[model samples]
Target: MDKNALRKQILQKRMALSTIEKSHLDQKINQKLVAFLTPKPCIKTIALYEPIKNEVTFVDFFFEFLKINQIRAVYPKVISDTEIIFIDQETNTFEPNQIDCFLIPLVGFNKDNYRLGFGKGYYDRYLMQLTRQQPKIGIAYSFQKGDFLADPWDVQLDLIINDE
Candidate 1:
């Protein structure tokens, strides 16, 4: 199936997750991240996004992560119909605009990468504009990675942090 088809399937599956279920999964993912990454003292100014229905949750934990005092939070802002850019995020407003950044990107992808998003091309278009800026990382469920898509248009991420 094409990326769009795959995305639809995934989104549907995600929408089925209940709020409590999502929160439980979120804790597992966060614990795994902390165990491996160890939240460095210098890794400040991290980027995160809002979780859509069924998508993995990050809002509550990310804020607590930000409260570390060593890290600053930046979230993506979809400026145009096909663009998303990172901005300094206010703790009180993380939900109005954020999303599930794909995981394959983080394992391996590059400046010349092109990610097959939900056919919107918002993140792709926005990342393209950043000739040089902070790296784009993918926080995902371990299952989200796979041998999918072999095209060059798929956007790549710097690193993918997963629970397992």
Candidate 2:
């Protein structure tokens, strides 16, 4: 189908999952992610998004890991009618500046370097402002896995984490 149809299908499948299922998958994904993320001292900051019921949730993992450890965390604030800004996540010192960010992308076309979002263009525009070397990781369920998302405008993730 199209992007909208595909996103809706994905959302439906995700929302249909039980909390216990989601939590178990979260554990599986994090266990692998922690191994890769914790060693990279360069990654002092992390950007996360809030899940709206059906979506893949990352906030719990971030906070749980944050409390378990001592790394800095950040979240997004929808600043404009169609834009997002990174919040400092420490001391809640989040301000809307024109700063590019390393984002945790929401969906994946494949784990290599491809994705298909809601077509809102928020993450695409946000990534444009960042310089090179920013780390953008995408977290998703196994079902969201696919091949080409149909275009180059679809953002390529720096990395993608999914559980088999």
Candidate 3:
């Protein structure tokens, strides 16, 4: 499927989830992420998103977990069309190359793990500016996975987690 069609289909499926069901799945995915990363000592700073629309929200949990574990939590600030700067939640400052991981939101993703964002290339553009390679993990509902061709400029994800 094409990006537009795939986004529509996956978003409709996501919208079908009840509040309770979404929360349960969100918690499950959150725990999975915590378990997956807890043993990785190299991950010191994580860039997170502020959930918009019906996108899966686990940043709040991640913030608390990372803090207690003495890790840094940063949120993205869309400064311009091609620039996304991550700001420390506590210090309200910008520091380059501090993020070791990014928790990405997705409208859909393919088996190869390339993400379909909201038709804008914010993440793709932002990632291009990174000085070092950082893992991009797409967070979405399991139903969002399918086959789709990615644009040349698209940034593929290293991992994805969902209710399934």
Judged by lDDT, which candidate is best? 3
Q: Per-residue lDDT of 69-161 in model 3, one digit per residue for the tens?
A: 888878888788766788985658556577888889888889888988876788888787677777888888888887889987677888988
> What RMSD does model 1 have?
6.1
Expressed as tens digits, the lDDT of each residue in 23-92 for candidate 2 is 8887777776776666676565566676666555654565676566666667777778779877764537
Q: lDDT of each model, Cα atoms only?
A: 0.52, 0.67, 0.82
Q: Candidates ranked by lDDT, best first? A: 3, 2, 1
lDDT per residue for candidate 1 within 42-141, as digits (tens), equals 4455556666555556656656755865565666666678656666645333322242222222322222332445556565555555433445556665
Candidate 3 residue-wise lDDT at 43 = 87
TM-score of 2: 0.80
lDDT: worst 10-residue window of model 1: 100-109
In model 3, the worst 10-residue window by lDDT is: 89-98
Question: Global lDDT for candidate 3?
Answer: 0.82
Worst 10 residues of 2 by lDDT: 93-102
Q: Give the TM-score of each candidate.
A: 0.66, 0.80, 0.91
Point out where model 3 deviates above 4 Å.
Answer: 59-61
